[PDB]
């Protein structure tokens, strides 16, 4: 048929078309395999499927006809498009629902987080809501995901089951609802050009829209990105040198919630007493003692990967170096300080032995506890006039 | 080529060491991962490519075993070679009308192509020849435990294109799996073999190819892959004697009791096979 | 005949749509054509045929993305050629040129179905009682785990585990009509080798397909 | 979870003994005026450092006998009760053993706290 | 040209002493470790680079022994040199159309480049010369027992730029492995060799480069690295006589009975090598 275009892809050309030989089934000519009003002996499109719903849209704008209809529908209509690493469309106007469906792109909000369905009227109804995310190869568009639900209970999953998970203390001044683009970008090497395509973009987009579990490679991705990064504030302009940022931590928290177990959502629960959480807090206070004793520019050899997965065989030397750092501290009139070693005794108290290994979910708890005990010690909180 | 009179199952255990057994072309080149369980995947066509490669090498083009490899050529050249060998009409593009000529082209393609004879090959062309299914249908191999891949940043001294910032040197990245033990499930239906002449000698070649599948595929990405245990389930009837899923769960691959932590060698894995139905002979000497 | 309900389930499945064939996007559920093809991989003889009356969906519908390097167009010859000898090496480039397609399958996960099916009798029948003998041979094969070939769930990359369900159709995941499935393929016709598509009655618990051999379409 | 006096694992014992030795030394003089620290060579050399640690600890405890301030002979009794389970000082320790050493140190240090381990 | 007709498997034992055998670009410059077990890793490209350096040194860049140098060479310019050396045009952004032309450019890139002929290369860039796998492979070297990387903080009396804070001084850093005995596995496949003409003299050059690999690669960051044992398995045929894992398990590396502390010398280790199968000959004379 005619060509779909204008998606963020390679050639912006048509989909559902055959140009090769190995897509030949029950031999048909070139586009009779997918016959939608082209050969009028049978039409797939109305004579839970996407191009029939498209055709349902292309006759909502008018107060081979099927091909014409749905390909002028994919040729949108203005604002119903977005991109995570591949295009994502949506459409419903049967009651003028005030389209606000977004992947996301102090205390900046327009709705609740999760307390009830939003108080703006004409937003809670039964009219269906469609969301089609289609990805490019070179000129053929894989339907990476497709969703039909009701905005009556689509908002009830996109935030009212999803941003209730990534809610976590804001480390700095930024947005409360972390946008899916920023969330995915903290899992890539450096930027949103190398977002893992299938098992993060499509995977957890489908999770956000669907309420199903996250991919079982979301947490290993954030883990292996925590290891593969290092503090470097001399290369970035936005102020953040942390390796466990607000987004990596929020995302590990959401994974641990919707896959494993309920965990601390707040700045710090010092009554937690779960060995991974406690070891993360201990690592955090060690690095605090280090960075306070010597300004550290601002460089330190990275043991977070080592201590997260093999706590004993690293925490021995980590605690010895922390003793040295508290010594260098107490040598100066910076000790009445001395409550760093006190915190270390307190945390070691609840720990019978340093565990040999830690599972990936235990590592995620380690990262969450580190993030918590890290924001606990900083001095920036609630700065907005 | 007397076809096989028994049908088979097989469970192949192969492990990887500091390598990438299979990359996902959508996840960069990271090892494939089942997003619903976490265990690493290795698609069936991956191991089929490795089987074809082993048969290509170990046979040196010895006829009755030509293996449609990758080379600088096209299928349709040989579709048409068979065509002129049988003197047909070049127009038809589906299954031909007369049965003897289509059967002749299919039987020539199956009598001298081990991969067509074993896995099948689809010969629908402007000059058509038909289809084949072939006995051996393999499936996605999945690790026994969730694998976690490690991004290994590497460096290169030289630069490909002209330099303007020399830094200019680029940083590469090797995705490796520290360890994984992958289990593949296989099925060899005897009647499809009877339709494509898949013989007994072909079956022993298939077993050797499953055993030495990686001894010939070494490279910078794979590291040390190796076939650890190959377990064969042979049914006495040419149809089944016991369900497929019933036999595949006779293979319990657990962690050896002496170990703890993430596995890093096949010594950290104990494999046991239970007793089989009265009409199934389980062969583990491979 | 009496009908028989077979249970078929697996980890992966891909019942490809007709439109989205190059970058595969499976139907939510097993269609009648795939179901009958599963049946004919357990028992089938050119004297009989299989018809499907219902398909019960016993598990959530969950999709997944798996891209594979795949052979592209086996492109028509621009210049005729012939082999130098009868039996010698000939090839197919599967790694150079545009002969590597990388098709992305949007295939299902953890699927579980129960198929209701029966036995008509066509030409080359031989008798009028073939229904009983063949129905009982299939029942024996389903019980004993026997099969002409390992059934798949769509593509042969996904093998189907099959048992004979003689008890009650187990608890499904869908008790109220929260799914309509759109408009699916009924069964590829072979009298004319065309595509009849059926879905005009909603899916409530079990997709209720009409017989492909009596009403090819709502058009007729 | 807290200090376990029945743990009787040698690195744990050494960590506790080191904690109580440095407790005796710090009860001698506040901190002279600075906590003398050679934990490094102690986990490096357990015995070759612990013997002189024990000499200096004997000095500190024998000096603390004149003053009625006590928390002092209890330190000596604890030294006996710890050394009682130990035999043949270890030439070298391992990574997990040094982690256990630090764990036992901080445990015995929490036990001898100014609050006597009633607050967390 | 000629090529080897024996399958070769080798195990090389090298150790470090207060040095950094291989740095991690993502961990600062800390030695590469497996973060879940603590064993130290040495990338295969590292040892390949050391072999390339030894060959560029002992041959001073003679003919047929160029090396794809580390002196900021441009790889596209080398490809273009290949194209002009075969009298073809390099302007195709892909391989030449005539398969003989691509064969010539790749046989040229292999014929006069030891490291391409041996370790293969990817020359599919703005000026495409193709792909080579190359017979010799190596996998990451993994120590025998976990290494403990210690950070040796150092200083320097001088400032590079204009600094106005220097009694005070600038601090530096070093990472040394007090000791690590590393084990590396290798594979020399005769099919790929006969594809690249990797000869016998190339093999003996490679063995010597493996022995004397570290005698000339000294720096302020390596300490004393040394190749202790080199075990080589010559299978009697062009394909294999025994699996690779059967051989790499004949090399048992344990700790000697007397020593108890952390390993600090090669005499703290015992290394035994079993008797190979009837199809393989083991030579430990390197």
Author numbering:
A (entry chain I): 78 to 124, 160 to 175, 240 to 253, 259 to 286, 329 to 519, 522 to 561, 564 to 612
B (entry chain B), E (entry chain C): 1 to 166, 171 to 290
C (entry chain A): 8 to 227
D (entry chain K): 1 to 31, 34 to 73, 76 to 124
Give excerpts from the publication.
CRISPR-RNA (clustered, regularly, interspaced, short palindromic repeats-RNA) along with Cas proteins assemble into RNA-guided adaptive immune complexes in prokaryotes. These CRISPR–Cas systems defend bacteria and archaea against the invasion of foreign genetic elements. The type I-C subtype is one of the most prevalent systems found in bacteria. Interestingly, type I-C Cascade only contains three unique Cas proteins in its operon: Cas5c, Cas7, and Cas8c3.
To understand the molecular basis for small-subunit incorporation, we determined a 3.1 Å resolution cryo-EM reconstruction of the type I-C Cascade complex, suitable for de novo model building (except for the flexible N terminus of Cas8c). The overall architecture of the complex resembles a caterpillar. Seven Cas7 subunits form a right-handed helical filament around the crRNA and Cas5c sits at the base of the complex. Cas5c and Cas7.7 clamp around the crRNA 5′-handle (nucleotides U1–G12), forcing it into a hooked conformation (inset). Cas5c residues “pinch” the phosphate groups within the crRNA backbone on either side of the U5 nucleobase, inducing a sharp (33°) kink. Nucleotides on either side of this kink are captured by a network of Cas5c π–π stacking interactions, while Cas7.7 makes non-specific contacts with the phosphate backbone. These highly conserved interactions (inset) suggest that the 5′ end of the crRNA handle is critical for type I-C Cascade assembly. Despite these differences, type I-C Cas7 maintains a highly conserved region of positive residues to form non-specific interactions with the phosphate backbone of the crRNA. The belly of the complex contains the large subunit, Cas8c, and two copies of the SSU, which nucleate and are derived from the C-terminal domain of Cas8c (residues 489–612). Remarkably, the electrostatic surface potential of the type I-C Cascade reveals a contiguous channel of positively charged residues that runs along the length of this minor filament from the large subunit.
